[PDB]
Each structure stands twice: as structure tokens, then as C-alpha cells.
């Protein structure tokens, strides 16, 4: 309230601000116990770590990947499930192993130097830390170490250095949790899950179609590019159900949760332009290493692949599980949401002054202008919606709107007070994906061309 200086200046060295953008907040359904709420919104990884999240933990990796995109959003939604324990699997090979573990606001970095021997040494080292033993627990088995927190304590485990997995187990099922999560907040668009079992993915895909959300998943499976006859992967599983979900194969999808990169390359992209994902670069992802036949198999199974070309990295073909391009799905959702929002906003403003709308021919037609404002015109201005006359079919692409008259409304609707049968039409544009060229080279003197000067005739006259 009281200012001691007429003019004051805060000199921040190095840092810079960023403008406020409009975007769709993604949701990452992680399993943990750091807070009681079902869903929270964060604006930076600093806030997440301040809430007890361990560096390198799944949620932290997802957030740091999401915030690094060219279209990254400025908020991230973190879901919450129950947690029973966690695993640190050393299957594979590894010289120095570092595991970041945080227990009840206490941060420590256990260290270690055949996988079974490394796991046993790590388990012994964990028990050496008296603080960890009092509040947490560790046990060795095979190539993985299982750690569990004492009931009144919260433990978070995240990647440090070395090669290993981090897998969290929970009794709560995604199908049971999502209906509760949506109740707290419906203000999010993208859907992602930490659990990577087939059943969880199928449940998320079924839920998303019903609740109008976009589902993303990275599979890290090796059957994803198996010969076409081997219909045994999750990608082929989703095809049979005709579900829609942007799935892609990768190698670090279970150590980094690279869904963040895709979301950051998709969050702040306005669907009105019809801007496909064909060649968008994404930080964090690693190029696909298979050969030509493997790529052909992956394409046949609709598993998108990140490929490196001419020194850079590029997504490819942006296809979904059902075979439809993700761009079309996003455009359809955009139209569906914004036509409704515009109409509702006009109706509410019209009924907030009195003089609410009435079902008569003298007031209905204004819906034409109301709808031609907002989506139908922004789409044309930004190039998403096509217009003009078609020369091949001899048809026009002009958007059309039709409104029924009062005499055609059945008496029942006048009691229900709801109008039906409003019709709209549109024509979607298309991006360019592939190009093929035909070149030619000449070595000797090219042969003299025909010297005909007539105007080329269109077609032969002989016809009966």
C-alpha cells in the first residue's frame, strides 16, 4: 500500500517474460499421493517440484517435455490415482547409477556402481539411509528393486543417471477414476495416461470418444512394426474397434513419456487453419531406427513414426487409429464446440435483457447471421473452409444454412420449446503431404520440334 519511492525498478538479470497465449490445457493422469485433490493445474515445473514431485518422475518428464514445444501451453493438468508401490527395473545393462528419491519433503540421491547385483546393491544402499528406512522401505528381487512408503509418508522416485525403468503400480482402475476426475473439472482437452497396460489404454480410448476428448498414447512396443499378418499389438487392437487415438511408436516412451512433445506441437495450434502435423518438428523425441520394411509395416498398422531427414527430425502422416487424419478430427471438434458456444452466447445475451427469443418466422432467421459470424467466417478468412465454384462437378462450395419455418414445427416441440432440424454444410480444405517429380536430361542436340502453328483442337470430330 505504501510506496517509499516515486519510481522503482527491479533489475532481473538474464530472465525474460513471455506473452499470454490461448490454448487447450492437457491432462496427464498420473498415480501418486502428493496432494488430495483429484486434479491440479501447474504453470511451470518449479511449482511441481515445490509440491514434492521428484525430478525425473513421470509427471515431471511429461511437463518438461510439454513446455518445450513451439506451440506449448501455459498450464498443465495433473491427475491423481492411488499408489501401492513403485519399481526400479534394471533389466538390460549399465557405469554410475543415480536414483533421485524424495520422501516427505526430504530429498536424497542414492548412488550405486549384472543387473541383479546392481539391484541388490541399490536395495542395500537404500536401507543404509536411516531417514529412508524410518519413512520408506526397499526390497530387492531379481533385476528390480521394489520400494514402498510407510503409510503417513509420501515417497517420489525419479530418474537420475543410468539405464533403468520406473514403474508405479496402483489398484485404482482408469475406468473408475476418470468419471470422478471429469466431475471436478471439465476444462481440459487432451487426455494422457501413465499406466501403459492394454486395458487402461482401451478404457481411456472408450472414455474419450464418449466425452469428446482427444486421446494420445506412446506404445514403446516392438510388435508395432511386425509383419502385417501379425495382428497382435495394441495398435491393431484399436483398429478393430474403430476408435480414434493418435498413437505412435517410440523407444523412450516409458522413460520420458514423450506425449508432452506431441502436445506441445499441438496445443497452441488453431484448428481454423487446417494446419496438419505432417512435418512438424518436436524436441525430445528420438528418430525411428528401423528399415524400410519396418516403416511400411508401421504405416500399415497406423503407428506414426518420428523420422530424421536432412539433419532434422520430423513427424509423419499424422494418421489416427481409425485411418482418418487427426487434422479432420480436430476441425470437426472445433466446429462442434464453437458453433454451440456462439449460439448460446447470443441467446443468453438476448434473454438477459428481457425480450427472449420466440419461435416465429420473424425472429428465427437471425440465426443465419449469428452463425455466419464466429466460426463460419473465421474459417474462411484463415483458409480452413473452402469457397468457390467447382469446374469438374459443376458445383459450388459456398457455405449454406437452412432454418425451418413455424408451420413445419410439430406441436410437440412447441410444448418442449426446443427447435430441431437446423442444417449447415461446409467443405474442408486440404494440406499437401507428398509430391512426385519427373525430370529429364538432354546430352546431344535436341531434335527439331514440330512447326505446327495451328491452335490445338480439342477433340476428334468423328462421332456418331
Amino acid at each position: 500500500e505504501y510506496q517509499d519511492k516515486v519510481v522503482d525498478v527491479e533489475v532481473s538479470l538474464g530472465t525474460q517474460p513471455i506473452d499470454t497465449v490461448g490454448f487447450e490445457t492437457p491432462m496427464f493422469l498420473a498415480m501418486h499421493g502428493n496432494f488430495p485433490e483429484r486434479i491440479r493445474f501447474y504453470v511451470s515445473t518449479a511449482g511441481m517440484v515445490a509440491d514434492g514431485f521428484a525430478v525425473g518422475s513421470p509427471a515431471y518428464q511429461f511437463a518438461t517435455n510439454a513446455f518445450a514445444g513451439n506451440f506449448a501451453p501455459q498450464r498443465v493438468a495433473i491427475g491423481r490415482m492411488s499408489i501401492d508401490s513403485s519399481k526400479v527395473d534394471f533389466t538390460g545393462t549399465t557405469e554410475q547409477v543415480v536414483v533421485n528419491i524424495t520422501l516427505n519433503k526430504v530429498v536424497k540421491a542414492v548412488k550405486i556402481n549384472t543387473p541383479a547385483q546392481i539391484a541388490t546393491a541399490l536395495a542395500d544402499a537404500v536401507t543404509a539411509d536411516a531417514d529412508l528406512t524410518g519413512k520408506a522401505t526397499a526390497v530387492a528381487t531379481g533385476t528390480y528393486v521394489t520400494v514402498t512408503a510407510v503409510s503417513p509418508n509420501v515417497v517420489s522416485v525419479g530418474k537420475g543417471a543410468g539405464v533403468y525403468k520406473i514403474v508405479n503400480e496402483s489398484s485404482e482402475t482408469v475406468a473408475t477414476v476418470l468419471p470422478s476426475v471429469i466431475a471436478e473439472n471439465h476444462n481440459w482437452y487432451f487426455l494422457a495416461t501413465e499406466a501403459r497396460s492394454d486395458a487402461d489404454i482401451v478404457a481411456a480410448a472408450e472414455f474419450a470418444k464418449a466425452n469428446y476428448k482427444l486421446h494420445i498414447y506412446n506404445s514403446t512396443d516392438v510388435d508395432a512394426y511386425a509383419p502385417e499378418n501379425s495382428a497382435a499389438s495394441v495398435f491393431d487392437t484399436l483398429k478393430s474397434l474403430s476408435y480414434d487415438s493418435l498413437g505412435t511408436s517410440d523407444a523412450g516412451a516409458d522413460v520420458d513419456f514423450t506425449e508432452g512433445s506431441v502436445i506441445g506441437a499441438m496445443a497452441a495450434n488453431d484448428p481454423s487453419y487446417g494446419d496438419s502435423l505432417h512435418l512438424k518438428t518436436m524436441p525430445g523425441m528420438v528418430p525411428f531406427a528401423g528399415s524400410d520394411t519396418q516403416r511400411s509395416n508401421a504405416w500399415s498398422r497406423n503407428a506414426n513414426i518420428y523420422r530424421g531427414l536432412y539433419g532434422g527430425g520430423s513427424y509423419i502422416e499424422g494418421k489416427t487409429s481409425s485411418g482418418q487424419y487427426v487434422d479432420v478430427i480436430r476441425f470437426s471438434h472445433w466446429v462442434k464446440f464453437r458453433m454451440e458456444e456462439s449460439v448460446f452466447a447470443y441467446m443468453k445475451r438476448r434473454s438477459d435483457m428481457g425480450l427472449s427469443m420466440k419461435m416465429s418466422d420473424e425472429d428465427l432467421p437471425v440465426l443465419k447471421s449469428v452463425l455466419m459470424n464466429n466460426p463460419i467466417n473465421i474459417g474462411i478468412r484463415n483458409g480452413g473452409i473452402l469457397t468457390g465454384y467447382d469446374t469438374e462437378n459443376k458445383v459450388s462450395y459456398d457455405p449454406t444454412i437452412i432454418i425451418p419455418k413455424r408451420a413445419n414445427i410439430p406441436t410437440n416441440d412447441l410444448a418442449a420449446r426446443i427447435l430441431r432440424d437446423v442444417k449447415v454444410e461446409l467443405v474442408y480444405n486440404n494440406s499437401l503431404h507428398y509430391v512426385k517429380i519427373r525430370a529429364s536430361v538432354v546430352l546431344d542436340r535436341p531434335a527439331g520440334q514440330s512447326t505446327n502453328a495451328q491452335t490445338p483442337m480439342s477433340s476428334s470430330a468423328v462421332g456418331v
Binding site: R350, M353, N373
Partner: protein
């Protein structure tokens, strides 16, 4: 649908009040009392070859207020004397106010621009004084104001 009466009261020309300098004007002509016109268009339009359209507002609000009086009216003398008084002393501005009966109103500063011609004939003559106005924006005096925040769109 039934025909609706556009107003409750009746447009009475006598209720239109003109105050020039703080005094009511009297002795008007037969057909038209006053006419108010803007000198320039409100908004200009620039159309490109490709079809791009851009517009610029106009800040010239000067206008002309015609005023018809019978040559026998006493107000002819007042304006005639004020013309020379302003010419000598150098002060030409004076307040102008118009009250509408069932229409718009006006309240701005004005001055005498041109003296009308005088003609003597069989019947009583007429003089159409021209009074300038600094701003020619006709303002309402009605319940208008609760709907201006409704027509807004785009």
C-alpha cells in the same frame, strides 16, 4: 399482425424550442423551421485492386443549420445588429440549442455564416438564415442507452 402507433404523444411543431444565446426564437416560416446537415461523410472507404477494404474516420464535424424567418419577424433586426457588432468587436461565437419534440436534439456552439437575400413582393417574404455549428452530432433525449450495448457484435 396489427398496426402499431409509433408514439403515444403527437409531434407538435410548436414544442420545438430554439435558443440562440439564451433567448427563444419566434416568427418562423410556413413549411420548414430548421434544417441540419453535415458537411462531410462520417467514414471514408479505400478499396484496393485485390479487394482489400480499409476505412478512416472523419473528424470534420462542422455543419450548417438553416433557419427560416418571416421578413416581418423582429428577430431579423437582432441578427442583423449582432452581425455588425461581431464584425467590429471580433467576437462571433454564441451558444446554440435545439430541443426536439419527438426526435433528436442539438446543443453546441454556432455562428452566423451567410445573411439571406431579401425580396419584396405581393406576399410576405421569407428569409433563410444560415447558422454554423461547431459540431453537428444530433444527440438523443430518450430511453435509448440500454440497447446500444446489445446491437454490438463482431
Amino acid at each position: 399482425n396489427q398496426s402499431k402507433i409509433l408514439t403515444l404523444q403527437a409531434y407538435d411543431p410548436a414544442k420545438v424550442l430554439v435558443f440562440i444565446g439564451g433567448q427563444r426564437v419566434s416568427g418562423f416560416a410556413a413549411d420548414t423551421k430548421i434544417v441540419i446537415t453535415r458537411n462531410n461523410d462520417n467514414i471514408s472507404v479505400h478499396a484496393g485492386v485485390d479487394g482489400e477494404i480499409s476505412n478512416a474516420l472523419s473528424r470534420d464535424n462542422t455543419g450548417v443549420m438553416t433557419l427560416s424567418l418571416q421578413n416581418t419577424a423582429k428577430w431579423n433586426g437582432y441578427l442583423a445588429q449582432w452581425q455588425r457588432q461581431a464584425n467590429v468587436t471580433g467576437l462571433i461565437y454564441l451558444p446554440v440549442q435545439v430541443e426536439g419534440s419527438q426526435g433528436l436534439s442539438l446543443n453546441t456552439i454556432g455562428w452566423i455564416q451567410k445573411q439571406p437575400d431579401l425580396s419584396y413582393g405581393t406576399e410576405v417574404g421569407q428569409m433563410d438564415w444560415e447558422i454554423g455549428v461547431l459540431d453537428a452530432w444530433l444527440s438523443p433525449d430518450q430511453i435509448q442507452g440500454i440497447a446500444a450495448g446489445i446491437t454490438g457484435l463482431l
